[PDB]
Structures are given as C-alpha cells and as structure tokens.
Amino acid sequence: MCLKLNLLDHVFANPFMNAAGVLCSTEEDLRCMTASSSGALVSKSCTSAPRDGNPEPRYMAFPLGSINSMGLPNLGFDFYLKYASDLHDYSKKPLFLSISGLSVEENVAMVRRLAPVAQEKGVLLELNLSCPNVPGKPQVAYDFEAMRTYLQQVSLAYGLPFGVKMPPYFDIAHFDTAAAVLNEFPLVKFVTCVNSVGNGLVIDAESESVVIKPKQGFGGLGGKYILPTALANVNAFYRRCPDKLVFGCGGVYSGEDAFLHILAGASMVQVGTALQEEGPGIFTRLEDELLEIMARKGYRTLEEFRGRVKTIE
Amino acid sequence: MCLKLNLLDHVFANPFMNAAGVLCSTEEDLRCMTASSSGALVSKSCTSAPRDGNPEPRYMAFPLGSINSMGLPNLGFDFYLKYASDLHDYSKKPLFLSISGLSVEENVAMVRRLAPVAQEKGVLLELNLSCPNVPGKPQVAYDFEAMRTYLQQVSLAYGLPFGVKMPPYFDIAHFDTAAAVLNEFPLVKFVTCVNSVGNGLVIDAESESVVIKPKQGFGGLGGKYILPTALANVNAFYRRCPDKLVFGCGGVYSGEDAFLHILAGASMVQVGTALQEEGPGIFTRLEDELLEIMARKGYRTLEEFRGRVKTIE
C-alpha cells in the first residue's frame, strides 16, 4: 500500500503539497515545508520586484474556509530563483516555483532566466494565470485572447515543460474554450485546478463589518466553501485534457477530501486554507487518513482509482 | 415591532420568500407557500411548453448545501399564468412569476402575454437570465451582448417594471460590465443575486460516484457553500445600481444570514436550499431570529441597516 507517484520526470513520496501562497513566502517557510512530510512544495507566486502586498487585515479564516486579498506580497523573483538554484534540497522532495507577473513581458523576462535553472536542478514552473492583467479587464484566465497570448509567449521564451494554475470556471462553454486554449500548447504538461473562488464577501454579524481591508472586503474564497467547485474543475479538465496532468486544489481538509480529488482525476493534491490553519503537521494526518481509506477499499496505489469517479448511467 | 415593508408598489409583511425553483412548481406548492409566513412567493421558472426536466436523481443535499441539475421541469407558462390570473390570493402576499424561455423569441412571447395580467393583477416578472447549455456559447448573463439583446427585446415587448435573476460573477470587471448593461434598462427595477453557483461536482467517498445523474454529476450549488459569493454579488450590484433594488438569494439558513444579506444591500431575501430541507416552517424561525438580532442591536427598521455593511478604512 503506497502513496508514491512518478510524474513530470520526478518522484514524489505522496501526492500532497502546499497550495501556492501558503507557508511558502520566506526561506523559513520553504525550509518548513521541506521538513514536513509533504510530497512536494510550491513557492509563493512571485513578481520581478519584491512586493509588500495589500494592507492588513488581508486574510481571515472561519469554520468553513478563508477569504484573502493578499495582493501578491513576495520577496521577488531573484529570491525564489536563488532558493531554487542554491538553497533547496532536491533530495528531500521536488520544488515547484510559481510565477505571477503583472504583464506578459514581466512573465517572459522571469521564465527566460528560470529556464537554465529548471534544466539544471529540475525546478518545475507553475504559471499563475488566475491573476491581474490590465485593470478593468478580467483576470488573465477569464480573457481567452490574453490567455493565448501569455501561453504563446511563455512557451517561446521558456521552451520547457511547465504548468498553469487556473481559476475556477462555472459555465460548460468556458470549460470547453479554456481546455481548447490549453490544448494548443504542448509544453503545458500540468493544469492546477483551482485558484480561489473570486471576489467573495465575508461579513461579521456582530460588528456589521467586512473582515478584510483591501477591495471593500472582497476577496478570494478558499476551504470548505469551494470543494465541489474545485472537484468539478479538476474533473472537467481531466476529461478535456487527456495529454496533460491535473493537480487538484481546493477544500482539502482530510484524506477523504484528497481521495475525492484523486477520483476526480487529480495527480497532485494541494492544501491551502487547511494548511494555513492546522500547520504542516496536517500532512501526516492526510497521509494516514488517505491510506486508511485505501486499506478499507482494497486499493494499493493511487493509479487504481485516479479519475475513476463513477457517473450514474 | 414588525418587519413590514413596501417595494415595487406592493406591501410585504416581511422580506422573506422562496427562491424560484423551491416549493413552487405545482398548485399545491404555491398554495403551501401562500399559507406560509413568507412575505411573498415566486413561481418556478417556466417555458412556453411543460417540461419533465432531467432524469433523477437530480437534486441532493448535504450538511453544507445542495447540488441540482433539475432541467427546468415545470408545468408550462399557461399554468403559471392561470395561477397568477385566477388562483393566487393577492390579499395574502405578492406574487412573482419567473420566466426562463429557451430563446429570446420564447421570452418575448411569454412577456407579451404576461403584461395585461401584471397590469390587472400586480404579478411581478423575474426574468431568469440562466439557460440550458448550447455548446459554443456561454449562458446568457455570461455573454453581455446577448444579455443586452434579451433585455432590449423584453423591455420593448413587456413595457412594465420587471426584475432579473443573475448568476454569480467572480471578477470585478464583470460586475462593472454587467451592472452597466443592466443600468441601460430603466424597466429593470430589481436584480436578484444569486442563482446557483454553476457546475460544481459532488462525489460520495463510499460509493466513489457522483450524486446526481444529469451532466455527469455536474450541477448548480446552493446553501452554505455559496453565502460569501451571494453577499459579494448583492453588495456589488447594490453599489453599482443605485436606482434598482437588489434581492438577495444564497446561503440563508438563519436570521443571522438574512441579516448579512440586508446589510449587504438586500431588499427581499430568498431561501432555496434551507427551505427545501426544512420546509415552510423555516419562515417563522427566520422572522423570529432576524427580529431578535434587530432587538439586541436596537434596530427598529430594515432601512436602518440595509446596505450599511462597514468597510475597514
């Protein structure tokens, strides 16, 4: 009975990893995630220049999940590139490095410089498409002409397998078009579904107030609120992108939640909100809980049930 | 103290009502909602001809919410028209009639016929800008040029105040564009936010199967999953549409949740999943809990706090 996976030319002890943005902004964080029993880790989405991000409070969590408008606080690309090329212990577990440039040119400049490090050390790129373009236009993955442009230019500039982090879609027509854009880029080898459910609004009844400061309290939703949304997107892309891997992310608190992602078609399973809340010890629990479910069901590996969600008739 | 209010030239005993689709498909349902403590009721969204809807199971509910792909099962427009014109006891509470034709022309023909019943009887039109999936094109409220066409044609054909039921949006630029469309139309006097969060997917771990049969298990989400999404849409439209009313719908299971909708800007508050699960008694509880919250805060009227959610700085 084992949780091991071999994909993208790397070996993973188990499918669990942090979600970009959680426990991965500083050297301390990355060392902590590397010391954990996670199967991999991903760095905070970075920009060319370091950013302080939005004013606080900018993250809050509640029994059913979390709202955040962090605003891409990060130490800058040069720090994450240096962690990848000089500080990370690849003998421990593999590393993904997330990039979230604020223009297509910014992203190009960062991937050109990541490419030699990726080829030499085996760092894996996750391009964050669930991200600001021109303000008053939708985020990049909700503008399919912008998305095509970003994938065209990053494909050219990077030249190596990479993956994309995608926002949730809610319309079948959007699933169709999005997968068809992604399917034009043979270097996109993995798709991470999903980023936060955008622009939710949490109000505290006692104080009659929003709970985060940026954007009049509007921010992205994570946690229990979003598990069915995240399962739908994992499965919609698993079905439409047969030549690609799908990583699942959204609402994972337990081995049972991970198991459902995996049934939906997930390879890797990321943990955001619950990890932010419980801390890195969560990975032992999730591993134990998932193995307990496999044992009861007689499953010995993950490939025996990945993507095998049953439909009715 | 009482929660009485006046909107759209009608009086309401309180701001609660069913969400379209729940407890409102047959004469029996509508009679049951009429006998309840709700302040108003809305009929099931209807098409020109009767529809059996999708194969069962097509609705399922869980501790955190519901998923549905009903398929617009309804008795047809002639039935809801007759109910509006000859059966509803307007002395008890106002009636809204939801229309969801499968094309613009279908909707224009229904509204032409509904207009003299509205004039004579005071039934209010809720036009449902969600539709069944036509491969290649998004749902109507997700295609803003289609949406403007629907509204132009309906406004022309109906000629009287009406409201629109909106899917949720998740991006600020979409809120801007959607609200700008809706503000082109002076006859749109109310906006209902929100319809179910589209195409989520619930999987049962024990059976390793989806839980509803249509669309490979994909369906709209309601209930606790969607409250912060519903609050964000209510507030976004409340802010952008100062000459319109906003009706809130999504995640209401208590007087507290209702209270947050009204803080967000809601004039009426619709209950879908919680009403499906608990039955029409829910309306007396919601009344009692909302007044209790009011009492303890010293609010005597809904107007005192509607739309007064506080932001931080």
Ligand SMILES: Cc1cc2nc3c(=O)[nH]c(=O)nc-3n(C[C@H](O)[C@H](O)[C@H](O)COP(=O)(O)O)c2cc1C
């Ligand atoms: C505080 C916070 C920061 C995040 N930052 C990023 C980021 O920098 N890049 C990114 O792709 N996603 C980011 N996310 C999104 C998470 O990676 C994840 O997609 C989302 O929270 C859903 O997973 P969950 O339900 O486990 O939280 C962030 C989420 C949170 C709560």
Ligand SMILES: Cc1cc2nc3c(=O)[nH]c(=O)nc-3n(C[C@H](O)[C@H](O)[C@H](O)COP(=O)(O)O)c2cc1C
């Ligand atoms: C079984 C079922 C049928 C529904 N039918 C309709 C409908 O005919 N028209 C409509 O506008 N919305 C319909 N909805 C959406 C609800 O009106 C409401 O927008 C949604 O359930 C979210 O509110 P909730 O969180 O209270 O459930 C339906 C929902 C359910 C669960």
Ligand SMILES: O=C(O)c1[nH]c(=O)[nH]c(=O)c1CCc1ccc(OC(F)(F)F)cc1
């Ligand atoms: O840094 C974040 O805010 C963040 N949070 C997430 O949940 N997902 C992400 O992808 C990111 C980085 C991308 C991004 C999303 C929303 C933004 O608008 C905001 F108002 F939060 F600043 C900015 C960056």
Ligand SMILES: O=C(O)c1[nH]c(=O)[nH]c(=O)c1CCc1ccc(OC(F)(F)F)cc1
């Ligand atoms: O009757 C419905 O299924 C339904 N359920 C909702 O949650 N909201 C609605 O507005 C409706 C009626 C409109 C409608 C939406 C999506 C549909 O696709 C489907 F998959 F269910 F066949 C059909 C009707």
